[PDB]
mmCIF file of N, CA and C and ligand atoms in Angstrom:
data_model
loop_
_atom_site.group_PDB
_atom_site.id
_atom_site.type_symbol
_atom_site.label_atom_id
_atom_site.label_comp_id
_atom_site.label_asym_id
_atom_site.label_seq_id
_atom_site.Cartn_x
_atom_site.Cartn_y
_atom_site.Cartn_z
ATOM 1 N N UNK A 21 -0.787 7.911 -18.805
ATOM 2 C CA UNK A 21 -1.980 7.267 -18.181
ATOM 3 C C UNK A 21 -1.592 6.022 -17.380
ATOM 4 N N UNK A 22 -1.050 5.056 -17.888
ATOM 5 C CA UNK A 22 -0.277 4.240 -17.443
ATOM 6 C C UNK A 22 0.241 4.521 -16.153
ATOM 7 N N UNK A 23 1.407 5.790 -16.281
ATOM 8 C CA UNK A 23 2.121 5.637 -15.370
ATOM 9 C C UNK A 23 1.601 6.381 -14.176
ATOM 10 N N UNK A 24 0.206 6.698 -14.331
ATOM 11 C CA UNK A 24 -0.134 7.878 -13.348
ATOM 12 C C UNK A 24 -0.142 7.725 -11.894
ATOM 13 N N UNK A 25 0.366 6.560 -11.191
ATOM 14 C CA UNK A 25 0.785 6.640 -9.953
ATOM 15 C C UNK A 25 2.221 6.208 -9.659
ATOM 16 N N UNK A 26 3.118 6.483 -10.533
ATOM 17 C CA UNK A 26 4.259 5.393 -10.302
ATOM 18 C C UNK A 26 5.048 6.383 -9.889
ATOM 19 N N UNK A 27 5.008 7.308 -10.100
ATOM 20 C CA UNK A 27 5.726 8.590 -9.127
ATOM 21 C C UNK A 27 5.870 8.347 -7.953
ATOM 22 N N UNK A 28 4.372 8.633 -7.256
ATOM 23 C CA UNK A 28 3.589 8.140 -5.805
ATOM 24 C C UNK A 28 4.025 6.693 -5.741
ATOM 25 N N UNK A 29 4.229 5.620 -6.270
ATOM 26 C CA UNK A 29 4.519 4.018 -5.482
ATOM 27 C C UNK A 29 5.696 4.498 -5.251
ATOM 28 N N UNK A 30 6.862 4.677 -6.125
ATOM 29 C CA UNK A 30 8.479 5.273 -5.904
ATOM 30 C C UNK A 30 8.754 5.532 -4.482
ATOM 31 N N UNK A 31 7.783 6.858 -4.696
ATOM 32 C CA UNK A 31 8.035 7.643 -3.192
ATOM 33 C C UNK A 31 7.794 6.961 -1.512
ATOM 34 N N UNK A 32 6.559 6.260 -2.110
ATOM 35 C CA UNK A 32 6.106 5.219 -1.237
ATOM 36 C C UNK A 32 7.428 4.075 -0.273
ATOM 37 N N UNK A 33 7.533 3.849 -1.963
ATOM 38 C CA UNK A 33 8.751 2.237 -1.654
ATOM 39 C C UNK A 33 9.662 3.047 -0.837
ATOM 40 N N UNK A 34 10.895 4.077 -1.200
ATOM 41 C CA UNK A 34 11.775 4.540 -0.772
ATOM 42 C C UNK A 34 11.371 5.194 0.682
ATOM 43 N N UNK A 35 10.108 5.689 0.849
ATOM 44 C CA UNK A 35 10.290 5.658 2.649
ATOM 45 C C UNK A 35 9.952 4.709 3.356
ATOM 46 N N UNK A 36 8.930 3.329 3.006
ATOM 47 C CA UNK A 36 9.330 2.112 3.777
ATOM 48 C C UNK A 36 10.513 1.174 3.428
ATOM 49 N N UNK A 37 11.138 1.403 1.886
ATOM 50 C CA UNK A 37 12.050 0.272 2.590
ATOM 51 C C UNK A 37 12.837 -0.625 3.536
ATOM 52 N N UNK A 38 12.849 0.228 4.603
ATOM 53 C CA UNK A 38 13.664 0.192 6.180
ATOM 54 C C UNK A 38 12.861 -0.808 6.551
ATOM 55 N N UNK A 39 11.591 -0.934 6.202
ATOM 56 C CA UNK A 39 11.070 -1.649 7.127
ATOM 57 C C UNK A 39 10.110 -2.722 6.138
ATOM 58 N N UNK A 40 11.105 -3.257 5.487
ATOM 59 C CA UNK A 40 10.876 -4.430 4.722
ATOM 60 C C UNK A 40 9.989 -4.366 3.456
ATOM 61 N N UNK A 41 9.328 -3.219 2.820
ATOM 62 C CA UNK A 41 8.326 -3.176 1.749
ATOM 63 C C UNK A 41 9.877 -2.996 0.464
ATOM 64 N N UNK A 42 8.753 -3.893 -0.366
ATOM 65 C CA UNK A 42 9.625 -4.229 -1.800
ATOM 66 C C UNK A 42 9.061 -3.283 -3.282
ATOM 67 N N UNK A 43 7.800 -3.879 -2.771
ATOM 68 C CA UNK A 43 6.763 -2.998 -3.573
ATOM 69 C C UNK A 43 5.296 -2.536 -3.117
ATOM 70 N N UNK A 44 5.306 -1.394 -4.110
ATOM 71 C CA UNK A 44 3.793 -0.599 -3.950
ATOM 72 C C UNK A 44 3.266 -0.637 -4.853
ATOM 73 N N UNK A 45 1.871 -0.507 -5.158
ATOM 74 C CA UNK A 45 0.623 -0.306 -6.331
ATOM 75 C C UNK A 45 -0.120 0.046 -5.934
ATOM 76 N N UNK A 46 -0.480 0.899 -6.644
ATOM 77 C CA UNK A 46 -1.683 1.875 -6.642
ATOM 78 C C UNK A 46 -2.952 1.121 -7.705
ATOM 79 N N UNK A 47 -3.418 0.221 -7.009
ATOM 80 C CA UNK A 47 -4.780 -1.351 -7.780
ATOM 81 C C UNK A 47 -5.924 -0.422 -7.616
ATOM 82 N N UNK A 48 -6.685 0.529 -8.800
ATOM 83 C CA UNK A 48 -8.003 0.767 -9.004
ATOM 84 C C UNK A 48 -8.784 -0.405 -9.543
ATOM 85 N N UNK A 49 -10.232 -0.518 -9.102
ATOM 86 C CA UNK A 49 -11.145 -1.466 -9.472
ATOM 87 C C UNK A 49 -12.268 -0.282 -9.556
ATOM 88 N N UNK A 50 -13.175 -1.478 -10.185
ATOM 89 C CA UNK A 50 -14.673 -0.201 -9.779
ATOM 90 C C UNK A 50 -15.376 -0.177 -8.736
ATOM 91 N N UNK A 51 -15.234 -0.470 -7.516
ATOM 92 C CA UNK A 51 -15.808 -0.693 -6.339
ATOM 93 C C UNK A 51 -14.976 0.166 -5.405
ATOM 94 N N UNK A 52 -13.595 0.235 -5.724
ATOM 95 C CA UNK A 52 -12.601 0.926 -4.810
ATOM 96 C C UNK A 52 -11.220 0.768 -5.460
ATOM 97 N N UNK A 53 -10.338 1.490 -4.620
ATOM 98 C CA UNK A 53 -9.032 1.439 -4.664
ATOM 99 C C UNK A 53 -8.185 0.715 -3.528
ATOM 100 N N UNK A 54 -7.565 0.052 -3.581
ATOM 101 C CA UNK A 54 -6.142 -0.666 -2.506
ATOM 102 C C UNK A 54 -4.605 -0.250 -3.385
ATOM 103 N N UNK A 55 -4.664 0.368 -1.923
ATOM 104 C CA UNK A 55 -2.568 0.496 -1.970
ATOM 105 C C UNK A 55 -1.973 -1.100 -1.923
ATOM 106 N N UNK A 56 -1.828 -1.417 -2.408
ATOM 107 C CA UNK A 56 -0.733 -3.250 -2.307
ATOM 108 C C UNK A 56 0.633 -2.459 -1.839
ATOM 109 N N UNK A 57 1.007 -3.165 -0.703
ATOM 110 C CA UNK A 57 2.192 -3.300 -0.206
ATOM 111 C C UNK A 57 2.950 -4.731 -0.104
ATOM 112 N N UNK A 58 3.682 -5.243 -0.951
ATOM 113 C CA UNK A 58 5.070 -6.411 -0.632
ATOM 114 C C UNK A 58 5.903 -6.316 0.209
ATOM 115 N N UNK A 59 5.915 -6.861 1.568
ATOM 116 C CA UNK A 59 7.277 -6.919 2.274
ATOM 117 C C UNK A 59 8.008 -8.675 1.783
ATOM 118 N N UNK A 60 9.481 -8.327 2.075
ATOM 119 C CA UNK A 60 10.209 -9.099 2.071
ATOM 120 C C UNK A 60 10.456 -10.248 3.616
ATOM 121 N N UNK A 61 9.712 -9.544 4.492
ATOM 122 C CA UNK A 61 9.381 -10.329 5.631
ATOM 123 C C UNK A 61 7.932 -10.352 6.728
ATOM 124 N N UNK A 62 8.230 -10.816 7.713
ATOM 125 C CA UNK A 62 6.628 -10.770 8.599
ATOM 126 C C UNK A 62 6.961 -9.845 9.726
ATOM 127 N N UNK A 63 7.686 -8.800 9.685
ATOM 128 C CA UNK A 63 7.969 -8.070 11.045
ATOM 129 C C UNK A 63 6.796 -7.399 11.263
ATOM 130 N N UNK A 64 6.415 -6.902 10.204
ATOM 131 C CA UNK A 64 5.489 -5.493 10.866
ATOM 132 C C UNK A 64 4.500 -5.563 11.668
ATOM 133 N N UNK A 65 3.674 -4.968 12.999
ATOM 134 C CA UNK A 65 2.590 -5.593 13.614
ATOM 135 C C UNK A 65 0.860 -4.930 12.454
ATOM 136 N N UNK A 66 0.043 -5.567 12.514
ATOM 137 C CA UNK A 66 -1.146 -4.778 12.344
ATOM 138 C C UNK A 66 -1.012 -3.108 12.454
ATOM 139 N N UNK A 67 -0.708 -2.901 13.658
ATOM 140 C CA UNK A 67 -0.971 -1.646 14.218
ATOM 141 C C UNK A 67 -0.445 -0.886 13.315
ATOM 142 N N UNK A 68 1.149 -1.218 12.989
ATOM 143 C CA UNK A 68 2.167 -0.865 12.145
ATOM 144 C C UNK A 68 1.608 -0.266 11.057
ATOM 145 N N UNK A 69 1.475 -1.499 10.401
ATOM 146 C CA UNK A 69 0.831 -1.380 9.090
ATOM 147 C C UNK A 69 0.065 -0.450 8.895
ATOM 148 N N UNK A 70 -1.057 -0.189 9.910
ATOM 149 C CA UNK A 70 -2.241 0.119 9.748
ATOM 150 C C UNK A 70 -2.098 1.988 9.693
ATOM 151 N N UNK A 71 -0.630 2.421 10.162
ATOM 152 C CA UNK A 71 -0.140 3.674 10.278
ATOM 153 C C UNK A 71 0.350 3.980 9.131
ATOM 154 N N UNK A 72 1.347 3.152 8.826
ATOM 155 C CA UNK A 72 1.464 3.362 7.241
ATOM 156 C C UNK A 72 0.538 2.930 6.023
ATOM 157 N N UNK A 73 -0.451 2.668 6.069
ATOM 158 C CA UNK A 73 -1.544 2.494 5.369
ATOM 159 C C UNK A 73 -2.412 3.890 5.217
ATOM 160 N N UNK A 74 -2.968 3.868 6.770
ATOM 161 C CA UNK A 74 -3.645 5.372 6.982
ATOM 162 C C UNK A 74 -2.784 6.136 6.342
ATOM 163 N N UNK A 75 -1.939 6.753 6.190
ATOM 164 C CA UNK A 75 -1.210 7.990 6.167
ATOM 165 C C UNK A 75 -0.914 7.696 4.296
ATOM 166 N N UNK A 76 -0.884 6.456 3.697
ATOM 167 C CA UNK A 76 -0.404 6.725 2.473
ATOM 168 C C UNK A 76 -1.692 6.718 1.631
ATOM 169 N N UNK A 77 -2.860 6.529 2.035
ATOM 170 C CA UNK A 77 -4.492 6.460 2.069
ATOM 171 C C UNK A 77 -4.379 8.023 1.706
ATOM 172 N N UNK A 78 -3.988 8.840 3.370
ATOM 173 C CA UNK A 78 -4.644 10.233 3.087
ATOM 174 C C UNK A 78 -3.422 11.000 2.021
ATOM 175 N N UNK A 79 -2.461 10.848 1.677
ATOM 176 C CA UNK A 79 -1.796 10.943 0.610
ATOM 177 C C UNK A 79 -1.984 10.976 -0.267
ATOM 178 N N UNK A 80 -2.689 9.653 -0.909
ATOM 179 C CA UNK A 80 -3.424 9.719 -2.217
ATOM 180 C C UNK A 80 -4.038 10.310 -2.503
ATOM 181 N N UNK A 81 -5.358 10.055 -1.545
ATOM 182 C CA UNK A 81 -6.580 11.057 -1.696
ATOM 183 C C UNK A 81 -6.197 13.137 -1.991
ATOM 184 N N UNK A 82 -5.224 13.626 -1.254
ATOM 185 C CA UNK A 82 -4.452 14.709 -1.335
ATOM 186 C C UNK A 82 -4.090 14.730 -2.347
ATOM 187 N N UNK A 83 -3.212 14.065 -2.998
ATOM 188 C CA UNK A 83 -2.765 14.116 -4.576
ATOM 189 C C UNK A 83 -3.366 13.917 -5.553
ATOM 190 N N UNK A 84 -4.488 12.900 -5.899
ATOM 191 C CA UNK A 84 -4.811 12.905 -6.845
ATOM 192 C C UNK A 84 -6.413 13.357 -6.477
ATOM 193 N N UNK A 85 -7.025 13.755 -5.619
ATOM 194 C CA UNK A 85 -7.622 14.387 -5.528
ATOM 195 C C UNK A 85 -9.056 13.473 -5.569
ATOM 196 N N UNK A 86 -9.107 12.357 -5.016
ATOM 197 C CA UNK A 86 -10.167 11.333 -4.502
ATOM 198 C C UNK A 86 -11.209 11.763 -4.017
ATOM 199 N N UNK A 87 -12.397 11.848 -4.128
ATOM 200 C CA UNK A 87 -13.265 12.242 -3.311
ATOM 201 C C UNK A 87 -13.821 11.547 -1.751
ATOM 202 N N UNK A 88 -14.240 12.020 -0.795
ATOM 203 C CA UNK A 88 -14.660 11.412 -0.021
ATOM 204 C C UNK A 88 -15.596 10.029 -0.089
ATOM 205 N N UNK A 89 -16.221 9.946 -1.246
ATOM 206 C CA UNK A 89 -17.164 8.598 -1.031
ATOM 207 C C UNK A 89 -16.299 7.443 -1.911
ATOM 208 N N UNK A 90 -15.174 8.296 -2.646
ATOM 209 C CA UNK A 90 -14.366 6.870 -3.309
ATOM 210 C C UNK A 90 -13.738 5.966 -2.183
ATOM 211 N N UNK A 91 -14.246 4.410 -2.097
ATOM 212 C CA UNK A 91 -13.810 3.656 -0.982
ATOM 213 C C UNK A 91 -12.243 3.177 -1.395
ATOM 214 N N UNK A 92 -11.206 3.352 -0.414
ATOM 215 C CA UNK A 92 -10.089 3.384 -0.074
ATOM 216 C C UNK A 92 -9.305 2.079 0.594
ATOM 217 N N UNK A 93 -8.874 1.372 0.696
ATOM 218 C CA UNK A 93 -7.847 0.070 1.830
ATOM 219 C C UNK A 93 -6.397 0.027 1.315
ATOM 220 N N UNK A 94 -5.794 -1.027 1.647
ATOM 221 C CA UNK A 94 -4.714 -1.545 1.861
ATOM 222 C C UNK A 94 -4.445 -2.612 2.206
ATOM 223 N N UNK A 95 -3.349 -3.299 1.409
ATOM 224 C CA UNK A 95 -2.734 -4.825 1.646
ATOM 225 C C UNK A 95 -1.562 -4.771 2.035
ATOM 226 N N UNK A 96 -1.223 -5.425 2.929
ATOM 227 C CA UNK A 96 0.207 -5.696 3.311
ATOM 228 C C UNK A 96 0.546 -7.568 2.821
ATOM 229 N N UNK A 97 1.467 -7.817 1.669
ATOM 230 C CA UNK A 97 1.926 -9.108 1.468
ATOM 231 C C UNK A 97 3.002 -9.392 1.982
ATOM 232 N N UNK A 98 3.383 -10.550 2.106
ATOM 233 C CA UNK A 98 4.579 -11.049 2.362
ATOM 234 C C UNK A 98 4.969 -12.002 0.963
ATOM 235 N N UNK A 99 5.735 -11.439 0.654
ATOM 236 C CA UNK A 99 6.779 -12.309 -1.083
ATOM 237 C C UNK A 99 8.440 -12.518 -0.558
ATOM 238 N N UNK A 100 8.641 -13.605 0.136
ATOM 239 C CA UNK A 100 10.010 -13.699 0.446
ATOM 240 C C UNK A 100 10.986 -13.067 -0.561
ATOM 241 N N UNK A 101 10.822 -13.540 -1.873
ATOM 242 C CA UNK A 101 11.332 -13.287 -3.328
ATOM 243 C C UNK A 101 11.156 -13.886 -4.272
ATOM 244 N N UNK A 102 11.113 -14.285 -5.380
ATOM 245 C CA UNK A 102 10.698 -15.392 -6.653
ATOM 246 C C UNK A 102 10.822 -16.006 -6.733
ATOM 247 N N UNK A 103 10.905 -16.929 -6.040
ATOM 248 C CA UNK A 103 10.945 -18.357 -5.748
ATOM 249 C C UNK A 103 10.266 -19.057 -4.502
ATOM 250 N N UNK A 104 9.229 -17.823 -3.938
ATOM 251 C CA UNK A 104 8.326 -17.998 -3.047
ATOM 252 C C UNK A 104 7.351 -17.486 -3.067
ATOM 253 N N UNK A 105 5.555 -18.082 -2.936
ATOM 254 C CA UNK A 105 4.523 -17.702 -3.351
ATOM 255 C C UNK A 105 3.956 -16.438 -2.292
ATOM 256 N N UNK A 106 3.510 -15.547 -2.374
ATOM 257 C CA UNK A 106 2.748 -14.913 -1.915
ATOM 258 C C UNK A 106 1.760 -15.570 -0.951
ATOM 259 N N UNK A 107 2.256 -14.665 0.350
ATOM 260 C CA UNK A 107 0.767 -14.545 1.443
ATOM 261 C C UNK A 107 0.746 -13.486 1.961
ATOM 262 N N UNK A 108 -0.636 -13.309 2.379
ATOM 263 C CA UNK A 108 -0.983 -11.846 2.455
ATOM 264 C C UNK A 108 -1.342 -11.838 4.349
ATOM 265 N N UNK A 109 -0.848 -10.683 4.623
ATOM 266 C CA UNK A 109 -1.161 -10.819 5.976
ATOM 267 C C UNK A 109 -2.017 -9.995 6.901
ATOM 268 N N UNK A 110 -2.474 -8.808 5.868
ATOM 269 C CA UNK A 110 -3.293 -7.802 6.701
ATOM 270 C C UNK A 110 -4.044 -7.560 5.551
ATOM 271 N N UNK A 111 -5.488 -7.265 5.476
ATOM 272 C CA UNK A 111 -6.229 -6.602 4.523
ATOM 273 C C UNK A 111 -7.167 -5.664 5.302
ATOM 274 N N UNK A 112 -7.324 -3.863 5.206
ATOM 275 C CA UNK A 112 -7.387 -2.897 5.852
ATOM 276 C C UNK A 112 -8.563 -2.688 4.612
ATOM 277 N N UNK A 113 -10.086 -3.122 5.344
ATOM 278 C CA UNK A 113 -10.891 -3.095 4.170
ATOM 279 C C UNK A 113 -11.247 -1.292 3.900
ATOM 280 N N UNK A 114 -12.005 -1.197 2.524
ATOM 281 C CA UNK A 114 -11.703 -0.223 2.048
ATOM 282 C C UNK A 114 -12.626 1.180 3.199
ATOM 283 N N UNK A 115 -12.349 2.054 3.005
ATOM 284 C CA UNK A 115 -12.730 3.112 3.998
ATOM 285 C C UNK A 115 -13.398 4.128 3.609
HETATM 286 NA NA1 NA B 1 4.839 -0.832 -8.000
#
C-alpha cells in the first residue's frame, strides 16, 4: 500500500534524470493528486516542464486507472541539495 507508486516515481526519476530531476512523488490529497518533481537546478523552461508533466499525468491516469473527474497537476522544485531550502518554480494546477 505504501509502496503503490514507487515503481512509477523510479521509472519517472530514471527518464528525467538528464535533465536535472532528483526526485518524484506521487502526493494524493482529497481534493486531487500532484506529481512533485525535485530538480537539482533551474534549467528547465515552463514549456518544458509542462511536457513532462502532461505526459507523466496521462501515465498515471493509464496505470493506475484514475478516472476522468479525479483532478490531476504537477510541481516542478528546485532543492540544490541538503543544505539548501526548497523553491518551487512551476505549479501546473490540477486538471
Ligand atoms: Na520519490
Amino acid at each position: 500500500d505504501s509502496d503503490r507508486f514507487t515503481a512509477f516515481e523510479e521509472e519517472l526519476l530514471a527518464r528525467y534524470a538528464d535533465k536535472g530531476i532528483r526526485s518524484v512523488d506521487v502526493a494524493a490529497y482529497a481534493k486531487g493528486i500532484d506529481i512533485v518533481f525535485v530538480a537539482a537546478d533551474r534549467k528547465m523552461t515552463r514549456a518544458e516542464f509542462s511536457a513532462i508533466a502532461s505526459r507523466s499525468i496521462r501515465e498515471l491516469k493509464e496505470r493506475f486507472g484514475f478516472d476522468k473527474d479525479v483532478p490531476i497537476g504537477a510541481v516542478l522544485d528546485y532543492k540544490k541539495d541538503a543544505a539548501t531550502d526548497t523553491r518551487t518554480r512551476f505549479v501546473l494546477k490540477l486538471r
